[PDB]
Amino acid sequence: SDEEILEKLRSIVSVGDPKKKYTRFEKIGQGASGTVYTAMDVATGQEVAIKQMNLQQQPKKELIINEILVMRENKNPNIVNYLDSYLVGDELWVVMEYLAGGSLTDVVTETCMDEGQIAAVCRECLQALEFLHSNQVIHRNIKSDNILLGMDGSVKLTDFGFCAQITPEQSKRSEMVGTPYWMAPEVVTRKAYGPKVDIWSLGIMAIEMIEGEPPYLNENPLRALYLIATNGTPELQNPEKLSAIFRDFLNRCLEMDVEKRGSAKELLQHQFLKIAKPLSSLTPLIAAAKEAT
Ligand SMILES: Cc1nc(Nc2n[nH]c3c2CN(C(=O)N[C@H](CN(C)C)c2ccccc2)C3(C)C)c2sccc2n1
């Protein structure tokens, strides 16, 4: 019975020796959620990022299976590409594309962004969001840490461990999942929510690009969880620094009324995304974040 859920996971993964298909292994990161290596596809000569997790020691097969499956059926230019999976010696190896420009968290916490650079990032993310939302997938963990950057300034979404599928029959969801500071109020208050929670988290992510961090970050997770549920729409520290069209975009991402809050399809047409700079204008941000590290 359990955990015979592994049979699905062992049926998912590709077979064969990952050692044979990839060489030039170099460690690039090592968090609590695994360790990332760079490597070269012996075939195409292409560079890949391989995440290695301890298995059991995390876990949870139900949701890590969900992560693989969801990525496979949801390929998009604005989503970090999933390549392969291999289970070797109680380790789950997930081969992903390599983005060398680091994360949006490096940028937002070490640099200042102009409205043109923020609009370019918001656009790419909404493009990924509209695609997932049309395929009835809710990310539920949108934050700057899950935005990866290409050396050319490419903006791509990652981390599908927390996503959830939806149907016309079950159009909502009720689990208190995600990361506290980015969580929509309707999620914090255990109400039935929809895809628009990702829109809220995008808005908080925009606040990151503005102020360097999401609201209440000095407070502890539970304290922040309380602050969100009571205050509703978060206040900017210096709202007047923003153009009126940026403030409008923000207010529509952070609208308490789910019905009034924008959808990804809607927000892609907003006048704030007009003044978007090309993605090349992100490379000095990237360069700046690298320095001071
Ligand atoms: C680690 C690292 N990755 C880089 N680029 C990447 N290319 N491809 C990928 C990454 C990072 N990735 C990733 O899954 N990171 C997650 C954390 N994220 C999701 C919140 C992670 C990091 C460390 C340990 C476990 C899990 C993938 C998509 C494989 C880069 S660029 C400069 C430094 C750097 N350091």
Side-chain angles (χ1 to χ4, degrees), residues 156-189 191-205:
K156 296 179 183 187
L157 179 56
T158 196
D159 186 278
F160 288 73
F162 280 2
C163 67
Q165 293 265 8
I166 60 167
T167 53
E169 192 160 68
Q170 262 287 62
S171 58
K172 273 84 168 191
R173 218 72 182 196
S174 57
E175 319 81 316
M176 209 176 191
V177 310
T179 311
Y181 313 86
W182 290 265
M183 251 180 277
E186 56 269 9
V187 185
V188 187
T189 59
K191 302 181 184 170
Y193 56 82
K196 287 191 174 179
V197 300
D198 291 331
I199 297 302
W200 174 278
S201 303
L202 180 79
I204 302 296
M205 196 173 56

Coordinates of all heavy atoms in Angstrom, one line a residue, residues 156-205, unseen atoms left out:
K156 N 12.8 33.6 -16.4 CA 12.1 32.3 -16.4 C 11.7 31.8 -15.0 O 12.5 31.9 -14.0 CB 13.0 31.2 -17.1 CG 13.3 31.4 -18.5 CD 14.2 30.4 -19.1 CE 14.5 30.6 -20.6 NZ 15.3 29.5 -21.2
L157 N 10.5 31.2 -14.9 CA 10.0 30.7 -13.7 C 10.4 29.3 -13.4 O 10.5 28.4 -14.3 CB 8.4 30.8 -13.7 CG 7.6 30.3 -12.5 CD1 8.0 31.0 -11.3 CD2 6.1 30.5 -12.8
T158 N 10.6 29.0 -12.1 CA 11.0 27.7 -11.7 C 10.3 27.3 -10.4 O 9.4 28.0 -9.9 CB 12.5 27.5 -11.5 OG1 12.8 26.1 -11.5 CG2 13.0 28.2 -10.2
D159 N 10.6 26.1 -9.8 CA 10.1 25.6 -8.5 C 8.6 25.2 -8.5 O 7.8 26.0 -8.1 CB 10.5 26.5 -7.4 CG 10.1 26.0 -6.0 OD1 8.9 26.1 -5.6 OD2 11.0 25.4 -5.3
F160 N 8.3 24.0 -9.0 CA 6.9 23.6 -9.1 C 6.5 22.7 -8.0 O 5.5 21.9 -8.2 CB 6.6 23.0 -10.5 CG 6.6 24.0 -11.6 CD1 7.8 24.6 -12.0 CD2 5.4 24.4 -12.2 CE1 7.8 25.5 -13.1 CE2 5.4 25.4 -13.2 CZ 6.6 25.9 -13.7
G161 N 7.2 22.7 -6.9 CA 6.9 21.7 -5.9 C 5.6 21.9 -5.2 O 5.0 21.0 -4.6
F162 N 5.1 23.2 -5.3 CA 3.9 23.6 -4.5 C 2.7 23.8 -5.5 O 1.6 24.2 -5.0 CB 4.1 24.9 -3.8 CG 4.9 24.7 -2.5 CD1 5.3 23.4 -2.1 CD2 5.1 25.8 -1.7 CE1 6.0 23.3 -0.9 CE2 5.8 25.6 -0.5 CZ 6.2 24.4 -0.1
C163 N 2.9 23.5 -6.7 CA 1.8 23.8 -7.7 C 0.6 22.8 -7.5 O 0.7 21.8 -6.8 CB 2.2 23.8 -9.1 SG 2.8 22.1 -9.7
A164 N -0.6 23.2 -8.0 CA -1.8 22.5 -7.9 C -2.6 22.6 -9.2 O -2.7 23.7 -9.8 CB -2.6 22.9 -6.8
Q165 N -3.1 21.4 -9.7 CA -4.0 21.4 -10.9 C -5.4 21.8 -10.4 O -5.7 21.6 -9.3 CB -3.9 20.0 -11.5 CG -2.6 19.7 -12.1 CD -2.5 20.0 -13.6 OE1 -3.4 20.6 -14.2 NE2 -1.5 19.5 -14.2
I166 N -6.2 22.3 -11.4 CA -7.6 22.6 -11.1 C -8.4 22.1 -12.3 O -8.0 21.9 -13.4 CB -7.8 24.1 -10.9 CG1 -7.4 24.9 -12.1 CG2 -7.1 24.5 -9.6 CD1 -7.9 26.3 -12.0
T167 N -9.7 21.9 -12.0 CA -10.7 21.4 -13.0 C -11.9 22.3 -12.9 O -12.1 23.0 -12.0 CB -11.1 19.9 -12.7 OG1 -11.5 19.8 -11.3 CG2 -9.9 19.0 -13.0
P168 N -12.7 22.3 -14.0 CA -14.0 23.0 -13.9 C -14.9 22.5 -12.8 O -15.7 23.2 -12.2 CB -14.7 22.6 -15.3 CG -13.5 22.5 -16.2 CD -12.4 21.8 -15.4
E169 N -14.7 21.2 -12.4 CA -15.4 20.6 -11.2 C -14.8 21.2 -9.9 O -15.6 21.7 -9.1 CB -15.3 19.1 -11.2 CG -16.3 18.4 -10.3 CD -16.6 17.0 -10.6 OE1 -15.6 16.2 -10.5 OE2 -17.7 16.7 -11.0
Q170 N -13.5 21.1 -9.7 CA -12.9 21.7 -8.6 C -12.0 22.9 -9.0 O -10.8 22.8 -9.2 CB -12.0 20.7 -7.8 CG -12.7 20.0 -6.6 CD -12.8 21.0 -5.4 OE1 -13.4 22.0 -5.5 NE2 -12.2 20.6 -4.3
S171 N -12.7 24.0 -9.1 CA -12.0 25.3 -9.6 C -11.3 26.0 -8.5 O -10.6 27.0 -8.8 CB -13.1 26.2 -10.2 OG -14.1 26.5 -9.3
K172 N -11.4 25.6 -7.3 CA -10.7 26.2 -6.2 C -9.7 25.3 -5.4 O -9.5 24.1 -5.9 CB -11.7 26.8 -5.2 CG -12.1 28.2 -5.5 CD -13.3 28.2 -6.5 CE -13.9 29.6 -6.6 NZ -15.2 29.6 -7.4
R173 N -9.2 25.8 -4.3 CA -8.2 25.1 -3.6 C -8.1 25.7 -2.2 O -8.5 26.8 -2.0 CB -6.8 25.2 -4.3 CG -5.9 24.0 -4.2 CD -6.4 22.9 -5.1 NE -5.5 21.7 -5.0 CZ -5.5 20.7 -5.9 NH1 -6.3 20.7 -6.9 NH2 -4.7 19.7 -5.7
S174 N -7.7 24.9 -1.2 CA -7.9 25.3 0.2 C -6.8 25.0 1.2 O -6.9 25.2 2.4 CB -9.2 24.7 0.8 OG -9.2 23.3 0.7
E175 N -5.6 24.6 0.7 CA -4.4 24.3 1.5 C -3.6 25.6 1.8 O -3.3 26.4 0.9 CB -3.5 23.3 0.9 CG -4.3 22.1 0.2 CD -4.8 22.4 -1.2 OE1 -5.3 23.6 -1.4 OE2 -4.6 21.6 -2.1
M176 N -3.2 25.7 3.0 CA -2.3 26.8 3.4 C -0.9 26.6 3.0 O 0.0 26.3 3.8 CB -2.4 27.0 4.9 CG -2.2 28.4 5.4 SD -2.4 28.6 7.2 CE -2.4 30.3 7.4
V177 N -0.6 26.6 1.7 CA 0.7 26.4 1.2 C 1.3 27.6 0.5 O 0.6 28.5 0.1 CB 0.8 25.2 0.2 CG1 0.1 24.0 0.8 CG2 0.1 25.5 -1.1
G178 N 2.7 27.6 0.4 CA 3.4 28.8 -0.2 C 4.4 29.3 0.8 O 4.7 28.7 1.8
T179 N 4.9 30.5 0.5 CA 5.8 31.2 1.4 C 5.1 32.4 2.0 O 4.5 33.2 1.3 CB 7.1 31.6 0.6 OG1 7.6 30.5 -0.2 CG2 8.2 32.1 1.6
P180 N 5.1 32.5 3.3 CA 4.4 33.5 4.1 C 4.2 34.8 3.5 O 3.1 35.3 3.2 CB 5.1 33.5 5.4 CG 5.5 32.1 5.6 CD 5.9 31.5 4.2
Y181 N 5.4 35.5 3.4 CA 5.4 36.9 2.9 C 4.7 37.2 1.6 O 4.2 38.3 1.3 CB 6.8 37.5 3.0 CG 7.5 37.1 4.3 CD1 8.1 35.9 4.5 CD2 7.4 38.0 5.4 CE1 8.8 35.6 5.7 CE2 8.1 37.6 6.6 CZ 8.7 36.4 6.8 OH 9.3 36.1 8.0
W182 N 4.7 36.2 0.7 CA 4.1 36.3 -0.6 C 2.7 35.7 -0.7 O 2.1 35.8 -1.8 CB 5.0 35.5 -1.6 CG 6.4 36.2 -1.9 CD1 6.7 37.1 -2.9 CD2 7.6 36.1 -1.1 NE1 8.0 37.6 -2.8 CE2 8.5 36.9 -1.7 CE3 7.9 35.4 0.0 CZ2 9.8 37.0 -1.2 CZ3 9.2 35.5 0.5 CH2 10.2 36.3 -0.1
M183 N 2.2 35.2 0.3 CA 0.9 34.5 0.3 C -0.3 35.5 0.2 O -0.4 36.4 1.0 CB 0.8 33.5 1.5 CG 0.8 32.1 1.1 SD 0.6 31.0 2.5 CE 2.3 31.0 3.1
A184 N -1.2 35.2 -0.7 CA -2.4 35.9 -0.9 C -3.3 35.8 0.4 O -3.2 34.8 1.1 CB -3.2 35.4 -2.1
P185 N -4.0 36.9 0.7 CA -4.8 36.9 2.0 C -5.8 35.8 2.0 O -6.0 35.2 3.1 CB -5.6 38.3 1.8 CG -4.7 39.1 1.0 CD -4.1 38.2 0.0
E186 N -6.5 35.4 0.9 CA -7.4 34.4 0.9 C -6.8 33.0 1.1 O -7.5 32.1 1.5 CB -8.2 34.3 -0.5 CG -7.3 34.2 -1.7 CD -7.0 35.6 -2.3 OE1 -7.2 36.6 -1.6 OE2 -6.4 35.6 -3.4
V187 N -5.5 32.9 0.9 CA -4.8 31.7 1.3 C -4.4 31.7 2.8 O -4.6 30.7 3.4 CB -3.5 31.5 0.5 CG1 -2.8 30.2 0.8 CG2 -3.8 31.6 -1.0
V188 N -4.0 32.8 3.3 CA -3.7 33.0 4.7 C -4.9 32.8 5.6 O -4.8 32.3 6.7 CB -3.1 34.4 5.0 CG1 -2.6 34.4 6.4 CG2 -1.9 34.7 4.1
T189 N -6.1 33.0 5.0 CA -7.4 32.9 5.8 C -8.2 31.7 5.3 O -9.4 31.6 5.5 CB -8.3 34.2 5.7 OG1 -8.6 34.4 4.3 CG2 -7.5 35.4 6.3
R190 N -7.5 30.7 4.8 CA -8.1 29.4 4.5 C -9.4 29.4 3.7 O -10.3 28.6 4.0 CB -8.2 28.5 5.8 CG -6.9 27.9 6.3
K191 N -9.5 30.3 2.8 CA -10.7 30.4 1.9 C -10.4 29.7 0.6 O -9.3 29.3 0.3 CB -11.0 31.9 1.6 CG -11.3 32.7 2.9 CD -11.6 34.1 2.5 CE -11.8 35.0 3.7 NZ -11.9 36.5 3.3
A192 N -11.5 29.4 -0.1 CA -11.3 28.8 -1.4 C -10.8 29.7 -2.4 O -11.4 30.8 -2.7 CB -12.7 28.2 -1.9
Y193 N -9.6 29.4 -2.9 CA -8.9 30.4 -3.8 C -8.7 29.8 -5.2 O -8.8 28.6 -5.5 CB -7.6 30.8 -3.2 CG -6.6 29.7 -2.8 CD1 -5.8 29.1 -3.8 CD2 -6.6 29.3 -1.5 CE1 -4.9 28.1 -3.5 CE2 -5.7 28.3 -1.2 CZ -4.9 27.7 -2.1 OH -4.0 26.7 -1.8
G194 N -8.3 30.7 -6.1 CA -8.0 30.3 -7.5 C -6.7 30.8 -8.0 O -5.8 31.1 -7.2
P195 N -6.5 30.8 -9.4 CA -5.2 31.1 -10.0 C -4.7 32.5 -9.6 O -3.6 32.8 -9.7 CB -5.5 31.1 -11.5 CG -6.7 30.1 -11.6 CD -7.5 30.4 -10.3
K196 N -5.7 33.4 -9.2 CA -5.3 34.8 -8.9 C -4.4 35.0 -7.7 O -4.0 36.1 -7.4 CB -6.6 35.7 -8.9 CG -7.3 35.9 -10.2 CD -8.4 36.9 -10.1 CE -9.0 37.3 -11.4 NZ -10.1 38.3 -11.3
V197 N -4.2 33.9 -7.0 CA -3.3 34.0 -5.9 C -1.8 34.3 -6.4 O -1.0 34.9 -5.7 CB -3.3 32.7 -5.0 CG1 -4.7 32.6 -4.4 CG2 -2.9 31.5 -5.7
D198 N -1.5 33.7 -7.5 CA -0.2 33.9 -8.2 C -0.1 35.4 -8.6 O 1.0 35.9 -8.6 CB -0.1 33.0 -9.4 CG 0.0 31.6 -9.1 OD1 0.5 31.2 -8.0 OD2 -0.4 30.7 -9.9
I199 N -1.2 36.0 -8.9 CA -1.2 37.4 -9.2 C -0.8 38.3 -8.0 O 0.0 39.2 -8.1 CB -2.5 37.9 -9.8 CG1 -2.8 37.2 -11.1 CG2 -2.5 39.4 -10.0 CD1 -1.7 37.4 -12.2
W200 N -1.3 37.9 -6.9 CA -1.0 38.6 -5.6 C 0.5 38.4 -5.3 O 1.1 39.4 -4.9 CB -1.8 38.0 -4.4 CG -1.4 38.5 -3.1 CD1 -0.4 38.1 -2.3 CD2 -2.1 39.6 -2.4 NE1 -0.3 38.9 -1.2 CE2 -1.3 39.8 -1.2 CE3 -3.2 40.4 -2.7 CZ2 -1.7 40.8 -0.3 CZ3 -3.5 41.4 -1.7 CH2 -2.8 41.6 -0.5
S201 N 1.0 37.2 -5.5 CA 2.4 37.0 -5.2 C 3.3 37.7 -6.1 O 4.4 38.1 -5.7 CB 2.7 35.5 -5.2 OG 1.9 34.8 -4.3
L202 N 2.8 38.0 -7.3 CA 3.6 38.7 -8.3 C 3.7 40.2 -7.8 O 4.7 40.8 -7.9 CB 2.8 38.7 -9.7 CG 3.5 39.5 -10.8 CD1 4.7 38.7 -11.3 CD2 2.5 39.9 -11.8
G203 N 2.5 40.7 -7.3 CA 2.5 42.0 -6.8 C 3.4 42.2 -5.6 O 4.1 43.2 -5.5
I204 N 3.5 41.2 -4.7 CA 4.5 41.3 -3.6 C 5.9 41.2 -4.2 O 6.9 41.8 -3.7 CB 4.3 40.1 -2.7 CG1 2.9 40.1 -2.1 CG2 5.3 40.2 -1.5 CD1 2.6 41.4 -1.3
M205 N 6.1 40.4 -5.3 CA 7.4 40.3 -5.9 C 7.8 41.7 -6.5 O 8.9 42.1 -6.5 CB 7.4 39.2 -7.0 CG 8.8 38.9 -7.4 SD 9.0 37.4 -8.5 CE 7.9 37.9 -9.8

